[PDB]
């Protein structure tokens, strides 16, 4: 590994990165040919940090920095390599080694690169890159998935007007990446603040994606071997919790925050709530087919407790502002979601648990009917 | 997908190349900076193509087209476009300046430079109402590294928008005075004096009153400014007597001055001597009375 570093130090940054990628290809192909489980050694990670993310190992060495033009050359070469890589295991492992968080100062730069690379994958429709990004989002802690989702939403929803259509065309290309992007977006936009309301175009495109094919959200759940314990600190297997939070907290958040645009938002959120309810009813058959009915709950009670607390806080804050209608609508949506989840087995809890959880919420006829 | 890829490859591998860059700007977000960087190469050459023309043609349309594209991009979303384009444009002006009235006339004579100031003007005018700091800082920050070859953009903007530029210029000058550029501050203040003496005098008076490590040096900084620039002391001596007249103001002045050593108080006294010796235009009789 020491010999290659000396040779790469004599090359330009773009050629050095290209040679790093080629050597990683050869090394990982050889390792997968020799062993079924390759071990990511410190050597490739240090090489990627020094020559791809440009983190200087020596204090007194001037860092050769890629200009934006040369970095775009790097992105083009990287996308071409992913498209040309036939074997999926090598592709996924190299994507992970390129973009797995390491807990060092380089990660930020890595994020930017990834936050751009996936964006480029959206523009030219590189399906392998989208699949690798979906796998990364599945295997990455939520803090980086939220950053990637925010970057993608910035590029395709807030910066270029009308470019979101391109992201919409991703739906027929990489549904797994679409589901993971929706999960990361729901993890990002929790409607807690006025700056965390999801973009209007992004909300519309998400609603259209769910309404066209409701099974999209469950695709990961339908394609991943479900372990007994879901890891803590990662994206959820199914973003149903995020959709419930969006649908229930939309009226209060919009009241806290254009009449026709607000009407459009209300209609879109009602459509999303109906689609999520339909997904919940259809979830029972999928749970039964996997012999998981009554054993695994895709909606967790420990995730619903903070939602109820936030609902109570928002209702208390908005009560003096004559927000009774919004509070009633939010409570009705929450009661409907809870009833459908309990009926379909998505939420594994007793009626006493709901009695304890919803005791602090304002009185609602539908909520009381569901509770009783 | 394929056409966008072909456009990317053709762009990465002058008029046609710049139009390819503009199409990528309109279509592919991640390449923006690269296109912007390429656009830098579009502008610098133009200035050379202008400067050599002064010593003794198809890219002016490119500059105009880029200006229309940028104007449309700002008008579509100012909050997201104005800061980035303004910073890139200010970097452009800084670099082509490195590489006051006479310089102003020389540089507005070039079409590319005029377009650069125009896109800055529209960006700030889009950001005056909500948050111009990201623009003004991008100006002020750049003004650090490109003085005195930069000053004339600041002069033009202050002429167009004095109410904030004058205050920011005075604040950054005071900061530099505390730390240690002040000649550039004197030059620009003298330049905008002839047309905005009222606002300059008002801002100086408000800073003087507000002072009554940054707040202790305001009066010595003001004295140094007046001794450097006849225009400002001529503008302010009209109401200097009315400003020092109230007994409370004079008492506060004494109390503030008590905080410095005798070497510094001697310097403060000696500065006033130069001002009242070589400053008064018409209030000399009233001042001496």
Residue A72 has its nearest CB partner, among B4, B34, B77, at B34
CB of B100 closer than 8 Å to CB of B194 = no
CB of B143 closer than 8 Å to CB of B132 = no
Residues forming a β-bridge with A234: A141
- Phi and psi at residue A102, to the nearest 5°: -115, -5
Please check whether residue A84 touches B, CB under 8 A. no
**What one-character DSSP code corresponds to residue A350?**
-
Return the closest-CA partner of residue A206 out of A252, A147, A152, A161: A152
**CA atoms of B137 and B126, how far apart (whole Å):** 15
Residue pairs between chains A and B whose CB atoms are closer than 8 Å? 52
| DSSP line for A29-84 | HHHHHH-SS----HHHHHHHHHHTS---SSTTSPP-PPPHHHHHHHHHHHHHHHHH
- Strand ranges inside chain A, DSSP E: none
Residue B28 has its nearest CB partner, among A68, A69, A123, at A123
Determine how many CB atoms are found less than 10 A away from the CB of residue B105: 10
Please check whether residue A200 touches B, CB under 8 A. no
**CA atoms of A61 and A45, how far apart (whole Å):** 19
**Cα B14 to the center of its chain, rounded Å:** 32
Return the closest-CA partner of residue A116 out of A160, A166, A61, A154: A154
Q: What is the enclosing helix (H) or strand (E) of A276?
A: helix A259-289
**CA atoms of A327 and A323, how far apart (whole Å):** 6
Return the closest-CA partner of residue B12 out of B45, B42, B35: B35
Residue B29 has its nearest CB partner, among A73, A75, A155, at A155
Query: Residues with Cβ < 8 Å from A325, sequence gap 6 or more?
Result: none
Return the closest-CA partner of residue B42 out of B13, B72, B63, B70: B63
Show me where chain A is broken: residue before each gap, C-N > 2.5 A.
257
At residue A347, the 3 state secondary structure works out as: strand
- Cα distances from A67 to residues A7, A73, B38, in angstroms, run 22, 10, 11
**CA atoms of B188 and B100, how far apart (whole Å):** 8
**CA atoms of A134 and A174, how far apart (whole Å):** 9
Contact B1 A120 (CB under 8 A): no
**CA atoms of A283 and A184, how far apart (whole Å):** 21
- Phi and psi at residue A347, to the nearest 5°: -110, 120
Q: What is the resolution of this structure in A?
A: 3.2
**CA atoms of B208 and B117, how far apart (whole Å):** 32
At residue A170, the 3 state secondary structure works out as: coil
Query: Residues with Cβ < 8 Å from A27, sequence gap 6 or more?
Result: A44
**CA atoms of B171 and B259, how far apart (whole Å):** 22
**What one-character DSSP code corresponds to residue A214?**
G
List residues of chain B with CB under 8 Å from any CB of chain A: 1, 4-5, 8-9, 12, 26-31, 33-34, 36-38, 76-77, 80
- Phi and psi at residue A235, to the nearest 5°: -65, 145
Cα angle B34-B37-B42, degrees, rounded to a multiple of 5: 125
CB of A279 closer than 8 Å to CB of A179 = no
Q: How was this model experimentally determined? A: cryo-EM
Q: What is the enclosing helix (H) or strand (E) of A19?
A: helix A13-34
Query: Residues with Cβ < 8 Å from B76, sequence gap 6 or more?
Result: A161
* Chain B residues near residue A67 by CB distance under 8 angstroms: 34, 37
- Phi and psi at residue A58, to the nearest 5°: -105, 135
**CA atoms of B133 and B114, how far apart (whole Å):** 22
Residue B258 burial class via C-beta count within 10 angstroms: exposed 0-12, middle 13-18, buried 19 and up: exposed
At residue A113, the 3 state secondary structure works out as: helix
Q: Which residue of A has its CA nearest to B75?
A: A161
R_g (Cα) of chain A, nearest Å: 23
| DSSP line for chain B | -HHHHHHHHHHH--HHHHHHHHHHHHH-GGGHHHHHHHHHHHHHHHHHHHHHHHH--TTHHHHHHHHHHHHHHHHH-HHHHHHHHHHHHHHHHHHHHH--HHHHHHHHTSHHHHHHHHHHHHHHHHHTTT--HHHHHHHHHHHHHHTTTSHHHHHHHHHH-HHHHHHHHHHHHHHHHHH--HHHHHHHHHHHHHHHHHHHHHHHHHHHHHH--TTTTHHHHHHHHHHH-HHHHHHHHHHHHHHH-SHHHHHHHHHHHTTS-HHHHHHHHHHHHHHHHH--SS-HHHHH-
Rounded to 10°, the helix B60-76/B15-27 angle is 10
Return the closest-CA partner of residue A201 out of A147, A134, A155: A155
At residue A234, the 3 state secondary structure works out as: strand
Determine how many CB atoms are found less than 10 A away from the CB of residue A94: 22
CB of B278 closer than 8 Å to CB of B229 = no
Please check whether residue A73 touches B, CB under 8 A. yes
Query: Residues with Cβ < 8 Å from B254, sequence gap 6 or more?
Result: none
Buried b (16+ CB within 10 A) or exposed e, A41-76: eeebbbbbbbbbbbbeeeeeeeeeebebbbbbbbbb
**CA atoms of A40 and A99, how far apart (whole Å):** 12
At residue A349, the 3 state secondary structure works out as: coil
Show me where chain B is broken: residue before each gap, C-N > 2.5 A.
13, 56, 99, 180, 212
Determine how many CB atoms are found less than 10 A away from the CB of residue B13: 8
CB of A82 closer than 8 Å to CB of A91 = yes
CB of A84 closer than 8 Å to CB of A27 = no
Could you report how far apart the first and last alpha carbons of chain A are, in Å?
68
Determine how many CB atoms are found less than 10 A away from the CB of residue B180: 7
Q: What is the enclosing helix (H) or strand (E) of A330?
A: helix A324-344
Rounded to 10°, the helix B111-127/B60-76 angle is 0
- Cα distances from B260 to residues B52, B208, B221, in angstroms, run 55, 17, 14
Contact B30 A72 (CB under 8 A): yes
CB of A80 closer than 8 Å to CB of A91 = no
- Cα distances from A313 to residues A250, B282, B288, in angstroms, run 14, 68, 69
**CA atoms of A363 and A328, how far apart (whole Å):** 9
Residue A120 has its nearest CB partner, among B9, B30, B77, at B30
At residue A280, the 3 state secondary structure works out as: helix
Return the closest-CA partner of residue A83 out of B7, B5, B49: B5
Return the closest-CA partner of residue A99 out of A75, A66, A132: A132
Rounded to 10°, the helix B247-257/B230-244 angle is 120
Residue A297 burial class via C-beta count within 10 angstroms: exposed 0-12, middle 13-18, buried 19 and up: middle
Assign residue A103 a region: left if phi > 0, alpha if psi is -120 to 50, beta otherwise? left
Q: Which residue of A has its CA nearest to B73?
A: A160
Contact B27 A125 (CB under 8 A): no
* Chain B residues near residue A155 by CB distance under 8 angstroms: 29-30
Considering only residues 306 to 365 of chain A, which have any Cβ-Cβ distance to chain B shorter than 8 Å?
Answer: none
Determine how many CB atoms are found less than 10 A away from the CB of residue A286: 17
Count the alpha carbons within 13 Å of B205 in the hemisphere toward its beta carbon. Answer: 17
**What one-character DSSP code corresponds to residue A12?**
-
Assign residue A294 a region: left if phi > 0, alpha if psi is -120 to 50, beta otherwise? left
Please check whether residue A173 touches B, CB under 8 A. no
């Amino acid at each position: 590994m020491s010999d290659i570093r000396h040779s790469l130090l004599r090359r330009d940054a773009l050629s050095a990165a290209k040679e790093v990628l080629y050597h990683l290809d050869i090394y990982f192909s050889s390792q997968l040919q020799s062993a079924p489980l390759p071990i990511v050694d410190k050597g490739p990670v240090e090489l990627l940090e020094e020559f791809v993310f440009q983190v200087p190992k020596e204090r007194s060495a001037q860092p050769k920095r890629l200009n934006s033009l040369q970095e775009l050359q790097l992105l083009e070469i990287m996308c071409n390599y992913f498209q040309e890589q036939t074997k999926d295991s090598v592709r996924q492992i190299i994507f992970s080694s390129l973009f797995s968080p390491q807990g060092n100062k380089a990660d930020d730069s890595r994020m930017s690169l990834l936050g751009k690379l996936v964006s480029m994958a959206v523009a030219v429709c590189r399906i392998p890159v989208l699949e690798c990004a979906a796998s990364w989002l599945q295997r990455t802690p939520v803090v980086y998935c939220v950053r990637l989702a925010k970057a993608l939403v910035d590029d395709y929803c807030c910066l270029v007007p009308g470019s979101i259509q391109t992201l919409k065309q991703i739906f027929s290309a990489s549904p797994r990446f679409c589901c993971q992007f929706i999960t990361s977006v729901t993890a990002l936009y929790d409607l807690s603040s006025d700056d965390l309301i999801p973009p209007m175009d992004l909300l519309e495109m998400i609603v259209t994606w769910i309404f066209e094919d409701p099974r999209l959200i469950l695709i990961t759940f339908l394609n991943t071997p479900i372990a007994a314990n879901l890891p803590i600190g990662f994206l959820e297997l199914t973003p149903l919790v995020g959709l419930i939070r969006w649908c229930v907290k939309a009226p209060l958040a919009y009241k806290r925050k254009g009449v026709g645009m607000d009407r459009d938002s209300h209609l879109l959120y009602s459509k999303l709530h109906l689609s999520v309810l339909q997904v919940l009813m259809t979830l029972q058959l999928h749970l039964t087919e996997k012999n998981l009915y009554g054993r695994l709950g895709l909606i967790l009670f420990d995730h619903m407790v903070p939602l109820v607390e936030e609902i109570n806080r928002l209702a208390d804050e908005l009560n003096p502002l004559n927000a009774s209608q919004e509070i009633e609508l939010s409570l009705d949506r929450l009661a409907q979601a809870l009833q459908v989840a309990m009926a379909s087995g998505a939420l594994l809890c007793t009626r006493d648990d709901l009695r304890t959880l919803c005791s602090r919420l304002p009185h609602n006829n539908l909520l009381q009917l569901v509770i009783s | 997908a394929q056409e966008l890829s072909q456009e990317i490859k053709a762009f990465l591998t002058a008029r046609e190349h710049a139009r390819c860059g503009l199409l990528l700007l309109r279509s592919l977000p991640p390449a923006r900076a690269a296109v912007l960087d390429h656009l830098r190469g579009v502008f610098d050459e133009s200035v050379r193509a202008h400067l050599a023309a002064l010593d003794e043609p198809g890219l002016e349309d490119v500059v105009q087209e880029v200006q229309q594209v940028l104007s449309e991009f700002i008008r579509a979303n100012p909050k997201a476009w104005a800061p980035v384009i303004s910073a890139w444009s200010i970097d452009l002006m800084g670099q082509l300046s490195s590489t006051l009235n006479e310089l102003l006339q020389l540089w507005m004579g070039c079409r590319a430079t005029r377009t650069l100031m125009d896109i800055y003007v529209q960006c700030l005018s889009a950001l005056i109402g909500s948050c111009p700091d990201a623009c003004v800082d991008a100006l002020l920050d750049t003004s650090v590294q490109h003085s005195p070859h930069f000053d004339w953009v600041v002069a033009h903007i202050g002429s167009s928008f004095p109410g904030t530029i004058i205050s920011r210029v005075l604040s950054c000058g005071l900061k530099d005075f505390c730390v240690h550029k002040i000649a550039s501050v004197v030059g620009i203040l003298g330049h905008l004096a002839s047309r905005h003496g009222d606002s300059i005098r008002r801002e100086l008076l408000r800073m003087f009153h507000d002072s009554l490590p940054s707040l202790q040096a305001t009066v010595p900084f003001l004295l140094q400014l007046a001794v450097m620039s006849p225009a400002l002391l001529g503008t302010v001596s009209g109401e200097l007597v009315d400003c020092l007249k109230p007994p409370a103001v004079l008492s506060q002045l004494q109390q503030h001055l008590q905080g410095f050593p005798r070497e510094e108080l001697d310097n403060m006294l000696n500065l006033a001597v130069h001002l009242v010796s070589q400053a008064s235009g018409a209030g000399a009789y009233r001042l001496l009375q």
